[PDB]
């Protein structure tokens, strides 16, 4: 308790400590070279070991914040490289630390990381495992300055396991590349979710966040009392606040305390927490955040008795509105792990809205009596969309399902740029691949999780380059109306067709030699453009052009000669398709 560095050092172990100190420094000093960070890591590690051997040695009594800032301020090139950030070094703690957070530039001006050739990676890995993994850890951390460090470490170890397994493999590429791709997709998803949660907290306020957190925690911990859930919600809320502010040190301490508590009160919270509650300090909270829903208690009363049939409803509600409403959410959510959180939120809002009306009426009990019937069309709405879309997905498979979305959404919002429609339709396609493989009871939470990020990202793009008032509308609506607003978008009949352009519908033989992935992109790009030029073409008319085109490509990649086939039959395709559409 005398030395904080010594304590984290012993809790973490040297390997973990060295890796975490690297990430921490990378995130603040995003411009310094790797070799300079390695020096810092080594100096701090050496210092930490002095304090382990003698708790009373010099500076071992200093706080982590103070030690960290001291080291940041020793970098002599600070004013030259980071300018204003160097002025933080003139301040005392905690203002100094606060000053550093202010200059932690997210989305910095750095070139995208390029994946080298498989044999190249594997050879660098075998020849120098440490620098290979540490160098890349440094490259990822500096580009993702807000990514919670220990989760970034959890990714790194999965990257190591991917190289260990696959480099020793017969077909390295067939092993490694789909593993690297899955990890890229999960990594980008985790990051986007983290940014999404901090954005929500900021745009919408604490109340909406707590309501979200009550529903989520209640689904996950159905055996827990409302007062345990209420406690966890308060703590969670403080944790996210601190973690969103960007202070790695405070964030990590707040998380550790929370995980420790949950594990000490295990039996009072969930039966499924045993695995997580034995794991080491570094992994506890990440494990807990991931845990499966517990099984719901079997003998649960009808909701109607406490929330519709009770005579004291308004009396219990006016006494403490947010508490009553929160109890409603807890009760509704633990009974429905199959609903999305935002759906549980729409329900709570509806109940609130009717209680605000009914409790002021002559006879309350006979006003709010049929409230549960207004729930029905709110529940069925996302259920039907998921059914319809997963049926369509299973008949067509990922790629053609993607093409169907492309047509649907290009017609709805044709002013959106072609490359953007292709991207979102492809991403939406993936959500179909992931979520439709689940049985009905798990589909809606799955969709919510993927859709919320796809929708956020989208809204962020549109913010940069505005195109439609309809998109702006849905993007700035309550968090709980967002997706319903997008779902309600009509075909744009206001839209004037894009002038025909021959270059857009000319194809060369280079499309026979491109990767399946890039072959798809090319064809999907043309499709969007086709819909933009002929927005009133029927599903049937469009299917005829797509069938011809497919054949047109088949006839000119598998024969003898090719360049003339594409130029010859292509002119015939464009002309025949043009007359078929008027
Ligand atoms: C000069 C001091 C440098 C020390 C660098 C900070 C590294 C310590 C932070 C690691 C604690 C993380 C504990 C995990 C908590 C959790 O998420 O459950
Ligand atoms: C941390 C160790 C990661 C090493 C993996 C190298 C490939 C990362 C490049 C990003 C990508 O896959 O697109
Ligand atoms: C233990 C108290 C937790 C606080 C819970 C407050 C209950 C509010 C439920 C109404 C739903 C509000 C939906 C949030 C976003 C929105 O307003 O659109
Ligand atoms: C950044 C703070 C994750 C915090 C870790 C504390 C673990 C207890 C909370 C477990 C419930 C899940 C909360 C995450 C919400 C979600 O699943 O989307
Ligand atoms: C899964 C299929 C994915 C295909 C994209 C179309 C998604 C339509 C279903 C939206 C359901 C969203 C549930 C979240 C909510 O309650 O609003
Ligand atoms: C630059 C921003 C582009 C604007 C967005 C254009 C693409 C619209 C995508 C709509 C996805 C909505 C998901 C709801 C599922 C549904 O009911 O269709
Ligand atoms: C004016 C009409 C112009 C007609 C040019 C033909 C454009 C059609 C491109 C759609 C591509 C669909 C490919 C579907 C598939 O992969 O099978």
From Swiss-Prot:
GO molecular function terms noted in the UniProt entry: antioxidant activity; copper ion binding; DNA binding; enterobactin binding; exogenous protein binding; fatty acid binding; identical protein binding; protein-folding chaperone binding
UniProt-listed CDD domains: ALBUMIN (cd00015)
Keyword Metal-binding in record: yes
Modifications after synthesis and translation: Glycated in diabetic patients.
Impact noted for substituting residue 370 to E: In Naskapi/Mersin/Komagome-1
Entry superkingdom: Eukaryota
Domain Albumin: 1-184, 185-377, 378-575
One example of a Gene Ontology biological process annotation: negative regulation of mitochondrial depolarization
Localization annotation: Secreted
Keywords, comma-separated and alphabetical: Calcium, Cleavage on pair of basic residues, Copper, Disease variant, Disulfide bond, Glycation, Glycoprotein, Lipid-binding, Metal-binding, Methylation, Phosphoprotein, Repeat, Secreted, Signal, Zinc
Residues with site note (Aspirin-acetylated lysine): 197
Residues annotated as site: Not glycated: 2, 18, 39, 62, 71, 91, 104, 134, 157, 172, 179, 188, 193, 203, 210, 238, 260, 272, 284, 357, 370, 387, 400, 412, 430, 434, 464, 473, 498, 517, 522, 536, 539, 555, 558, 562, 572
Family note: Belongs to the ALB/AFP/VDB family.
Name of this protein: Albumin
Lineage: Eukaryota, Metazoa, Chordata, Craniata, Vertebrata
